[PDB]
Each structure stands twice: as structure tokens, then as C-alpha cells.
Amino acid sequence: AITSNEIGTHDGYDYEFWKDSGGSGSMTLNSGGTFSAQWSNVNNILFRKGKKFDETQTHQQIGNMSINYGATYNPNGNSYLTVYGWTVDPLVEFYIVDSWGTWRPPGGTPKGTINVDGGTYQIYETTRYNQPSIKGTATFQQYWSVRTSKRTSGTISVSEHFRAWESLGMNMGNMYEVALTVEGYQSSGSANVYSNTLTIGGQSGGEQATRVEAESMTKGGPYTSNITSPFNGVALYANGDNVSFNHSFTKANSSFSLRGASNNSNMARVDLRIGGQNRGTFYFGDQYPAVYTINNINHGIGNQLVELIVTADDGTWDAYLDYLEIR
């Protein structure tokens, strides 16, 4: 188990154990986002598993964030069960607190409230003066959403809180981290986070879908042509044959579903490009219509060129395209 300050990645999740002097702590990393923790007579201790970012993107550019979790939570003293993280420029430490120990944080007068995920959160902004931070000993703002009543399982719509904060004038910088966290202050305790899933993107923005017919897009290359069998669509025959269109992306992540087919029993490949960058390859194994889906594409909001292009043709197959759905 982890008993001193450590940063790493475990089963795809970025984890961290942090304490200052005094007392002891133990963190045990389990599968997915899960972990158990125990602490005894600490000054400050933090256990978390989530994602660290490279400090280059806002939370809008990263996309919709949501955490689904469940915890056995037994603090003995001052403690939080909370989503936690940081932004830079401005340097901000933030909290979405769902439960706590003996003291409901953070004191002071709320700047607002948000009703979300079946509860009510009061929103606070505080200041830390010459305190430990990701940038050393520093003075920085703290943003809080604190539930009006305790709960230790459910879904936390992280992006909703970020937008709530920002509308109340609490500017956020580029993201540094988002993680489900157990914090202790001047206390002891144990906790078992048995469920902890951080999801970026694909939430119930996935039940609307935009279908763009291949035959309605702009044709390019030497031979691209319309077809009517095995569906209304286009055929891409040689390298450089392509179909493309400008799309106005409202959100930052999407899945792309191409319905198509090869002309014969050889496997056809169609490349996906956004803004001129390859983002993956659609595969059609045979002559029967099939839908191939490339999920979890981060591309950023705004109007961008979408291309579907054949680059690996060698005269043994053509590609037939019916439509592309963007979710």
C-alpha cells in the first residue's frame, strides 16, 4: 500500500497520496478509479484518483465531465468526500463536496446555489494565504460547491458546477486535475471508494445525432461518384477519392459512425480527417452494408472540415459510403 507522498497512474487513473508531517496514512489502489484509504492523527492528508491534464485546455475544450461514484466513508473528525482539482492561470483549488466529517466546509457566505444531481449545493469562494499548492507555497483562490446534506454515492455533473461557478464570476484557468478525493484535516478516518468512474464526453449528448448523407457532401479526387446500390451514397475508387463537408461542432467530443461497405470480399478502409489531421480509420470487411463507429474523438468546438478519404487503395476494392452520423 502507499504510505508516503506519491504520484502515478494506476489502471488508467492518475492517483496521488499527499500528506504533510504528522500521523500516518495508507492508500490501497484497486481496479478502475477505486481505492481504499485510512488515516490517523494527520495534519492534512489527501487521497485521490482521477485525471491529470497538461495545463493547455480549458474545461470546455476538454469537454463535458461527469463522475459516478460510491463510497463507504467513515471520517473521525474534519474530513471531506469531494471532487477536487486545480486550474492554472488563474491558480485555483476547487471542490465539489458531497459529504464531510464533523464540519461542513468552507465557512463564509454563499455566492449562489445550484440544484443538480438531485441535491442542492451552495457555492463559495475563499482565499488561501501562503499555503501549499501545486506551484509551491502560494496564495490562491478556492472555489466550492458544497451539498446542503451529506451523501456518499451518486453522479456528480462536474461540468455543471464549473459553468455555475463561472457565471458567478469565478473565472477558471486551464485544467490541471479532476479527481474523486478523500481529504482529512486534524483527524483520523477510513474510506473505501468502491466505485469511481470519470467520464469525459459521451453523456446524454448521444441520443440526438446528426446524419450527413455521403451523397450530399462535397466530392473530391479523380473518380468519386454517386451510387444507388447497395444504397444511395458514393463510391471512392482510388487514392485521393474523398468526400468532405464543414461541420459546426457544438461540443468538444463526438463519435463518428460511418455506414458503408466494400464492393467485394476484400476489406475496405476509409480514413477520417478533421481539420486535415487523421483521426482514425473506418473498416468495412465485406460487401454487406455495415456501420463502423470511431468513439471518443476530441476535436474542440467550432466549424471544422470533416473528410472521408481513401488512401490505401491498391486496385483490389472500392469503398461505398452511405452516410456519416455524428453523435
Q: Quick check: is 325 catalytic? A: no
Q: Between β-strands 112-116 and 119-131, what pairing exists: parallel, antiparallel or unpaired?
A: antiparallel
Q: Which does 318 bind (CB under 5 to 8 A by kind): Ca ion, a second copy, none?
A: Ca ion
Question: What amino acid occupies position 157?
Answer: S
Cβ(189)–Cβ(25) below 8 Å: no
State the residue for C-alpha cell 486496385.
315
Nearer to Ca ion, 171 or 265 (CB): 265
Q: Please answer whether residues 270 and 321 qualify as being in contact, where contact means their C-beta atoms are separated by less than 8 angstroms.
A: yes
9 binds a second copy (CB under 8 A): yes
Letters for 126-155 (x = contact with a second copy by CB under 8 A, - = none) are ----x-xx-xxx------------------
For residue 206, state whether it binds a second copy (rule: CB under 8 A).
no
Max intra-chain CA distance, the chain:
74
User: Torsion angle of alpha carbons 216, 219, 223, 226, nearest 10°?
Assistant: 10
Cis ω for the linkage preceding 230 (within 30 of 0) = yes
Q: Is 267 in the site for a second copy (CB under 8 A)?
A: yes
Choosing from 93, 160, 177, 307, which is the catalytic residue?
93
Q: Which residues are annotated as a binding site for Ca(2+)?
A: 44, 183, 213, 215, 232, 237, 313, 317-318, 322
Q: Which of 115, 216, 278, 316 binds a second copy (CB under 8 A)?
A: 316
Question: Of 26, 152, 232, 244, which lies in the binding site for Ca ion, with binding defined by CB under 5 A?
Answer: 232
To the query of whether residue 125 is one of the catalytic residues in this protein, the response is no
Could you tell me whether strands 319-326 and 277-284 are parallel, antiparallel, or unpaired per DSSP bridges? unpaired
The dihedral built from the CA positions of residue 231, 260, 266 and 276, taken in this order, carries a sign that is: positive
| 28, 31, 216, 246: which one binds a second copy (CB under 8 A) | 31
Report, in Å, the least distance between residue 6 CB and a second copy.
4
Helix (H, G, I), strand (E, B) or coil at 205: coil
Interface with Ca ion, residue 322, by CB under 5 A: yes
- Catalytic site positions: 93, 183
